[PDB]
Amino acid sequence: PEPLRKAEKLLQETGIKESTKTNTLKKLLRFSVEAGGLTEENVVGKLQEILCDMLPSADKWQEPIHSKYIVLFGSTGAGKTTTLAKLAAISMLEKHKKIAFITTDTYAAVEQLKTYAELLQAPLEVCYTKEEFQQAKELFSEYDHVFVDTAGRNFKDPQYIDELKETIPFESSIQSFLVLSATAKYEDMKHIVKRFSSVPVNQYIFTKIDETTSLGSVFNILAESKIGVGFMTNGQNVPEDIQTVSPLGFVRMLCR
Amino acid sequence: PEPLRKAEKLLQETGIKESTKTNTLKKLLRFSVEAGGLTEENVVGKLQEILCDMLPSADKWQEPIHSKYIVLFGSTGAGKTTTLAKLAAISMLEKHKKIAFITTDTYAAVEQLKTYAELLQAPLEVCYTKEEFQQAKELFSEYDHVFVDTAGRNFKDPQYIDELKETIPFESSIQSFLVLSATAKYEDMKHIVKRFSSVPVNQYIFTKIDETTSLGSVFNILAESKIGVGFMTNGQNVPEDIQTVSPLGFVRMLCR
Ligand SMILES: Nc1nc2c(ncn2[C@@H]2O[C@H](COP(=O)(O)OP(=O)(O)OP(=O)(O)O)[C@@H](O)[C@H]2O)c(=O)[nH]1
Ligand SMILES: Nc1nc2c(ncn2[C@@H]2O[C@H](COP(=O)(O)OP(=O)(O)OP(=O)(O)O)[C@@H](O)[C@H]2O)c(=O)[nH]1
Ligand SMILES: [Mg+2]
Numbered sequence: 001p002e003p004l005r006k007a008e009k010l011l012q013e014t015g016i017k018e019s020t021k022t023n024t025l026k027k028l029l030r031f032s033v034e035a036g037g038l039t040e041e042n043v044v045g046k047l048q049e050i051l052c053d054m055l056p057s058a059d060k061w062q063e064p065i066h067s068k069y070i071v072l073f074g075s076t077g078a079g080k081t082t083t084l085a086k087l088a089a090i091s092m093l094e095k096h097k098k099i100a101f102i103t104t105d106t107y108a109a110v111e112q113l114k115t116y117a118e119l120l121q122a123p124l125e126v127c128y129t130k131e132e133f134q135q136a137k138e139l140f141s142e143y144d145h146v147f148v149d150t151a152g153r154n155f156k157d158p159q160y161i162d163e164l165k166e167t168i169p170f171e172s173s174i175q176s177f178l179v180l181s182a183t184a185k186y187e188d189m190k191h192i193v194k195r196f197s198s199v200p201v202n203q204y205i206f207t208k209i210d211e212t213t214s215l216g217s218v219f220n221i222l223a224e225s226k227i228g229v230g231f232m233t234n235g236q237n238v239p240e241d242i243q244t245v246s247p248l249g250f251v252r253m254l255c256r
Numbered sequence: 257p258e259p260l261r262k263a264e265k266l267l268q269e270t271g272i273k274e275s276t277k278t279n280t281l282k283k284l285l286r287f288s289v290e291a292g293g294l295t296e297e298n299v300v301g302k303l304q305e306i307l308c309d310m311l312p313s314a315d316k317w318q319e320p321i322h323s324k325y326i327v328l329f330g331s332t333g334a335g336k337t338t339t340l341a342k343l344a345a346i347s348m349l350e351k352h353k354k355i356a357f358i359t360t361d362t363y364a365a366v367e368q369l370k371t372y373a374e375l376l377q378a379p380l381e382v383c384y385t386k387e388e389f390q391q392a393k394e395l396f397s398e399y400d401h402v403f404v405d406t407a408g409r410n411f412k413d414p415q416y417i418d419e420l421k422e423t424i425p426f427e428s429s430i431q432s433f434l435v436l437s438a439t440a441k442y443e444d445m446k447h448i449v450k451r452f453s454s455v456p457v458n459q460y461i462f463t464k465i466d467e468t469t470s471l472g473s474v475f476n477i478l479a480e481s482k483i484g485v486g487f488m489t490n491g492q493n494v495p496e497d498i499q500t501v502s503p504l505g506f507v508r509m510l511c512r
């Protein structure tokens with residue numbers, strides 16, 4: 001119909017959940033109806049404003065590196081290590097702070113980070129038991145930020161999730177990022193998000209936004225949980241390919 | 257209605273493309289109609305038989321390791337290396353043949369395979385230019401199978417795909433497997449499959465079937481290309497977690 005047809009088109013292109021498309025149009029029609037006729041001028045404004053109103057508050061998409069400990073975990077291959085290396089590098093040139101590493105990736109899959117840690121002249125401590133990961137903290141009792149890379153598996157198995165909670169206890173001075181790949185399938189993230197309810201993820205980290213066709217799926221998830229994204233990884237180059245997004249921002253990215 | 261309602265239910269559970277569900281039911285109704293009333297006995301037989309008839313011929317899901325050269329490539333993080341290590345190991349205990357390695361993963365991301373290659377007492381040759389990868393072949397001019405791991409990127413960039421075709425020329429004695437993650441999104445695989453048309457993939461390799469909720473998406477792809485799957489990777493343990501599937505098999509796995 002009116003600017004409502006301009007919206008439907010735009011919205012349909014996003015991988016967004018079929019229902020959501022519907023609702024959002026209704027919310028527009030309603031504004032149109034009980035506010036003041038929608039003009040083909042600010043449709044894309046209410047549209048983005050609405051979709052925006054579904055995602056967590058914009059104040060939950062910031063909290064950049066702050067705690068002495070940064071912990072990344074989640075999905076195999078998504079980019080926990082590569083991303084961690086970026087963040088560290090970032091806060092070493094965009095903050096000059098003291099970088100420190102701790103890898104929990106006990107189970108070959110660990111020489112990657114030692115060399116990187118080396119290229120930046122930063123110490124890394126490999127830790128097997130919750131005990132070891134504790135001794136390692138005191139060592140950096142006088143360090144700025146300590147990036148903790150963790151081994152990745154199929155958190156479907158309840159064993160790997162509690163094991164995660166055993167090695168990395170989660171005290172008051174720790175930032176947890178559940179690193180998921182924008183490449184990921186919606187009904188798949190739906191479950192893993194759930195399996196991680198028992199653990200305190202402060203923020204998400206959607207990677208490979210440069211590989212997935214649509215960013216629909218990722219909105220679908222976000223639009224049903226309380227924490228926003230802290231960074232979005234869009235490439236392999238380190239440390240250039242990382243970025244931070246805001247609800248409006250992410251949404252603008254979503255509308256293609 | 258008749259056993260047609262028993263089918264619809266079953267089919268709807270698979271992540272299979274919405275259209276396909278429809279068509280398949282029609283094909284059933286038709287059998288029902290012009291063949292001999294469908295009984296709630298062989299519905300799941302025609303059902304699997306039909307879905308089966310959409311996927312490539314069953315003779316295109318076999319061709320196990322045969323050529324002197326095995327090349328795996330595709331999607332970042334999907335499991336090219338981990339899988340390659342499995343295959344080699346396999347053909348060393350399930351065939352005693354001579355294992356050989358060549359890594360094209362020039363651009364840290366390479367010490368993983370040297371140690372593994374070491375644990376099996378097998379030689380690996382790292383190769384930068386098409387020239388180097390050629391010198392390496394002659395070295396194993398007297399070797400059984402040579403597994404070639406390749407670096408992974410965003411084959412969206414046309415640069416990485418032709419570069420793949422430059423280092424690994426693709427002569428008559430080579431087996432190419434496009435390693436995709438069952439974890440992957442359908443419209444995403446749709447494109448990468450395309451970007452790889454210029455290169456000769458003999459077989460697919462869907463990994464992480466143990467991580468994705470549905471296997472719908474993966475059928476969706478297969479049901480629109482000419483080559484079947486050669487192995488399916490369902491875990492991290494090496495070399496236990498690999499398997500081979502057949503259309504009927506894969507389909508039976510699909511119906512949950
Ligand atoms: N296209 C693209 N590739 C990425 C991105 N982030 C990481 N990668 C690549 O994905 C692959 C795996 O990255 P890793 O960082 O090793 O993945 P991980 O989560 O630590 O992997 P595990 O330790 O096995 O759980 C590498 O080839 C990375 O360079 C991204 O934003 N975009
Ligand atoms: N759950 C599960 N994890 C797997 C499977 N195959 C591989 N992985 C894990 O996924 C991660 C990445 O595997 P890799 O083999 O390094 O991936 P890759 O394709 O060589 O990665 P790049 O070289 O970065 O392109 C590792 O943690 C693997 O152990 C699988 O079938 N299931
Ligand atoms: Mg890692």
Ligand SMILES: [Mg+2]
Pocket residue numbers: 336337338361405406407408
């Ligand atoms: Mg690899």
